[PDB]
Amino acid sequence: FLPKILRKIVRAL
Secondary structure (H helix, E strand, C coil), X not given: CCXXXXXXXXXXX
């Protein structure tokens, strides 16, 4: 996975 796509998930979560 990537940091950009991963981080986005964290924020939303």
